[PDB]
Design a protein around this nucleic acid. Structure first.
Ligand SMILES: [K+]
Ligand SMILES: [K+]
Ligand SMILES: [K+]
Ligand SMILES: [Mg+2]
Ligand SMILES: [Mg+2]
Ligand SMILES: [Mg+2]
Ligand SMILES: [Mg+2]
Ligand SMILES: [Mg+2]
Ligand SMILES: [Mg+2]
Ligand SMILES: [Mg+2]
Ligand SMILES: [Mg+2]
Ligand SMILES: [Mg+2]
Ligand SMILES: [Mg+2]
Ligand SMILES: [Mg+2]
Ligand SMILES: [Mg+2]
Ligand SMILES: [Mg+2]
Ligand SMILES: [Mg+2]
Ligand SMILES: [Mg+2]
Ligand SMILES: [Mg+2]
Ligand SMILES: [Mg+2]
Ligand SMILES: [Mg+2]
Ligand SMILES: [Mg+2]
Ligand SMILES: [Mg+2]
Ligand SMILES: [Mg+2]
Ligand SMILES: [Mg+2]
Ligand SMILES: [Mg+2]
Ligand SMILES: [Mg+2]
Ligand SMILES: [Mg+2]
Lengths: 138, 208, 237, 150
RNA sequence: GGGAGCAAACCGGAUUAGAUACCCGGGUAGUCCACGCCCUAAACGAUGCGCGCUAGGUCUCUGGGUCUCCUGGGGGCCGAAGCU
RNA sequence: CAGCCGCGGUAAUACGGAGGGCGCGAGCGUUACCCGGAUUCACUGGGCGUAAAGGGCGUGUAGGCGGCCUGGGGCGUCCCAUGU
């Protein structure tokens, strides 16, 4: 079994980029979707589509990178420089609004899920609600 | 108390022109003229390269030595400054220069940094009317820093207000010379100031 | 200019000793051998030639590299054909990278070269006059193409980027770009402007490389007068 | 033009038939003080001859530091050897709150107000070396924008 | 119980300054078996179990298929990214 | 002498003195004690192949942890009001 799907997606992504794949299948949840979705908003992937990989639903996640480089090691800059799961099964994590953290004195995100839905920090903040810190992506 | 010793010899220590004694640490005699090198058996001899500390330290001892004050006294207005809003460095200087034993050296009345001291202490000065015999008095902005018509009629006062005919006053003061008064207008500013010192480095010594 | 349908000289090389990064440039594997998709080749060729063109007409210089004796000569020739240095015998402990000094060679090549000819040739003992003829003889071997080189070169053109990779590796530490005729046995990544197809096999080294020279000369100041190098294809068969 | 500043200089000892065979090494920063910094490690027989060499290597390994008002865009932690360096950026009036190495790299970046911690190996060579690939790493609301853009 | 060969202890023989040892000729417990105890270890990959991910090449064991290729399971070398 | 490192077997900047020098200043120094440095107990924030560190293995009880879709409840969690 999996232990944390989320984790696992994020990782599957951390893993994929780090060697410049084009696009990786993660297997699909509604939640899972909602998260991917935000990466789009903020431009961390190039997006995702639902696919059926032998008859079981997944989520191809078309990652995105910087431009070919100059000098030894022509390897793109990462866009997704950092992705870390925060809440963890059997270590849950909750922020209320005054607590919601500020990611890279401002340059990336936290993803929270709130009773109002999967948001960014600046998203939940404005919207004025707190919740479960999922992850943390610059 | 305060220091009380070879001053135009610290003129010499930091290695930089220090104003403390007046006409003389002024008039080809404060030694940074005659022997710019530092006091003691090892004066001309080359020194090994200041340790990252040393500097940090000197630059403070400088600033202090300058305003004739004790580190105990010194720090307290530091602590104040960092606690206070806005660029710490400045406000230190801000407050330093807000000292009356300075407000008076600034405003001419006596030549020297130590003179405005023993002139305040011995009574001869007033602020707004009331007298103040405390060097450590924190002049705000509004304050008429005066001579006491009581000593007013004195040799050392005439002389030194007479030398102050013609000369100029820091932006943040109005040395009126008729009623021997003198206003203190707004808190001075790093930019407004003279100082032979790297205030940004003084801070750096107290991050210890 | 430019050429089409050169299946009749080249298509692809090397068996299953590949590099998966190359992966994309492969079409399918026939009888365990790999077979490049020239069609992609064509796209790059342009993107690449476009790059030669400009640096040609800028005034600027290519450096050619084959220490491969599988193509040791085509280089010397096609690089003589464009007034452009070549390296041939073996690449060298930092030719570009330590250049300053690999250059102090050419210096004491000239010094020796024209210290022959006539003047004072023999004002010195002889246990030492066939020793110098040796030091020079040697400079002759590998420095010959490295001669016309005076500053750093504004390109590098390689045949086997894997066989010389101490060349490639070098380029980049200095920010110089890399052209190469790289095939499957090699690392696409570290080539800037790539020619997919045969590290090996005269047939194709010729065709390709020589065209590259077509293009250096053409604009710059010359015309298209078939090269004396098709005549060392007929010397393998 | 440039300021040369040199953190440390050391004595590495070789061994030989008949005894010790000494040698020297130098750590150098070069600043413009305006976003350009250099790190040099300079070894050779003679101290001077070292710093010298350091210098030269310095100016070739150049790091272009996006300042932003005496300070850094956004915190980093960086991990060279098990030297770890923590950089966090501050309001003017803060100071150069670092030690030793990581200071006179920022000092010489023309940084003025920033906060540092070292954790792990204290070793300068690496603590400097880290500090660099720390800077080398920073990015700007701009720079970021540019990556994600669509 | 069993006891052929081996072999702690132990008897002798060499050997060395000594030789309570390496060498030698013997030899009891033991080593074997039943049943009960002991629970130790360089009990070692000196690496806890599980699930997911992330280039390859090569050699080997055993299995399936449209069989000098493909696909599964195990042991082994090199090696991408990465770690240290 | 000495906090640690390590100083003295007739050139000791380290012992004792003197000159000078640095720091502070009606104080200054020693002791002891608490935080700190010490991410050296690591929640923020550490480790366990060779540095200290995987349990001889397994079975399995408490406990911890849980795949995909829908619906109800609102214990966790979140927001606002309010009292304290
Ligand atoms: K025996
Ligand atoms: K540890
Ligand atoms: K179990
Ligand atoms: Mg402040
Ligand atoms: Mg580590
Ligand atoms: Mg340590
Ligand atoms: Mg350090
Ligand atoms: Mg028995
Ligand atoms: Mg026997
Ligand atoms: Mg015996
Ligand atoms: Mg079969
Ligand atoms: Mg296997
Ligand atoms: Mg294998
Ligand atoms: Mg590697
Ligand atoms: Mg003592
Ligand atoms: Mg003596
Ligand atoms: Mg001694
Ligand atoms: Mg001492
Ligand atoms: Mg002494
Ligand atoms: Mg602690
Ligand atoms: Mg151990
Ligand atoms: Mg084990
Ligand atoms: Mg163990
Ligand atoms: Mg259970
Ligand atoms: Mg669940
Ligand atoms: Mg529900
Ligand atoms: Mg419900
Ligand atoms: Mg509730």
């Amino acid at each position: 079994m999996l232990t944390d799907p989320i984790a696992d997606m994020l990782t599957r992504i951390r893993n994929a980029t780090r060697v410049y794949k084009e696009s990786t299948d993660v297997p699909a949840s509604r939640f899972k979707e909602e998260i991917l979705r935000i990466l789009a908003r903020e431009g961390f992937i190039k997006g995702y589509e639902r696919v059926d990989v032998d008859g079981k639903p997944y989520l191809r996640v078309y990652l995105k990178y910087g431009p070919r480089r100059q000098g030894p090691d022509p390897r793109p800059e990462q866009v997704i420089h950092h992705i870390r799961r925060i809440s963890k099964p059997g270590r849950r994590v909750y922020v209320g609004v005054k607590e919601i953290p500020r990611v890279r004195r401002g340059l990336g995100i936290a993803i929270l899920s709130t009773s109002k839905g999967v948001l960014t920090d600046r998203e939940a903040r404005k919207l004025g609600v707190g919740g479960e810190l999922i992850c943390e992506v610059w | 108390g305060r220091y009380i010793g070879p001053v135009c010899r610290l003129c010499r220590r930091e290695g930089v022109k220090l104003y403390l004694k007046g006409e003389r640490c002024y008039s080809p005699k404060c030694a940074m003229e005659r022997r710019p090198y530092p006091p003691g058996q090892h004066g001309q001899k080359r020194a090994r390269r200041p340790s990252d500390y040393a500097v940090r330290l000197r630059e403070k001892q400088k600033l202090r030595r300058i305003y004739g004050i004790s580190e105990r006294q010194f720090r307290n207005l530091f602590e104040e400054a960092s606690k206070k809003k806005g660029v710490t460095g400045s406000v230190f200087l801000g407050l330093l220069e807000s000292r009356l034993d300075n407000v008076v050296y600034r405003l001419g009345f006596a030549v020297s940094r130590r003179q405005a001291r023993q002139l305040v202490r011995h009574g001869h000065i007033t602020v707004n009317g009331r007298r103040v015999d405390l060097p450590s008095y924190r002049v705000r902005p509004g304050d008429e820093i005066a001579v006491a018509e009581k000593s007013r009629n004195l040799e050392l006062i005439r002389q030194n207000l007479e030398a102050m005919k013609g000369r100029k006053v820091g932006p943040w003061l109005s040395l009126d010379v008729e009623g021997m008064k003198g206003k203190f207008l707004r808190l001075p500013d790093r930019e407004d100031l003279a100082l032979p010192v790297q205030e940004n480095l003084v801070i750096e010594f107290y991050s210890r | 200019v430019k050429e089409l349908l050169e299946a009749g000289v080249h298509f692809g090389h090397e068996r299953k000793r590949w590099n998966p990064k190359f992966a994309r440039y492969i079409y399918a594997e026939r009888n365990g051998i790999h077979i490049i998709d020239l069609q992609k080749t064509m796209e790059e060729l342009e993107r690449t030639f476009r790059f030669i063109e400009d640096l040609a007409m800028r005034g600027g210089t290519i450096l050619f590299v084959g220490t491969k004796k599988q193509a040791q000569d085509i280089v010397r020739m096609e690089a003589e054909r464009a007034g452009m240095p070549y390296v041939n015998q073996r690449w060298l402990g930092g030719m570009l990278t330590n250049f300053k000094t690999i250059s102090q060679r050419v210096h004491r090549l000239e010094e020796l070269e024209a210290l022959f000819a006539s003047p004072e040739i023999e004002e010195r003992p002889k246990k030492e006059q066939v020793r110098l003829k040796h030091e020079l003889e040697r400079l002759q071997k590998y420095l010959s193409g490295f001669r016309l080189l005076k500053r750093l070169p504004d390109a590098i053109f390689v045949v086997d980027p894997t066989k010389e990779a101490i060349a490639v590796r070098e380029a980049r530490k200095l920010f110089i770009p890399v052209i190469a005729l790289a095939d499957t046995d090699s690392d696409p990544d570290l080539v800037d402007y790539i020619i997919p197809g045969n590290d090996d096999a005269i047939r194709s080294i010729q065709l390709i490389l020589s065209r590259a020279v077509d293009l250096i000369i053409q604009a710059r100041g010359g015309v298209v007068e078939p090269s004396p190098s098709y005549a060392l294809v007929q010397e393998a068969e | 033009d440039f300021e040369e500043k040199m953190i440390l200089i050391r004595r590495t000892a070789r061994m030989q038939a008949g005894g010790r065979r000494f040698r020297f090494g130098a750590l150098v920063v070069v600043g413009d003080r305006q976003g350009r910094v250099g790190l040099g490690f300079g070894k050779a027989p003679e101290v001077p001859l070292a710093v010298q060499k350091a210098g030269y290597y310095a100016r070739r390994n150049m790091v272009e530091v996006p300042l932003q008002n005496g300070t850094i865009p956004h915190e980093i932690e960086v991990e060279f050897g098990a030297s770890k360096i923590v950089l966090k950026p501050a309001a003017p009036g803060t100071g150069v709150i670092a030690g030793a190495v990581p200071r006179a790299i920022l000092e010489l970046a023309g940084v003025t107000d920033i906060l540092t911690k070292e954790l792990g190996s204290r070793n300068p060579i690496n603590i400097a070396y880290a500090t660099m690939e720390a800077l080398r790493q920073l990015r700007t609301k701009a720079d970021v924008e540019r990556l994600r853009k669509g």
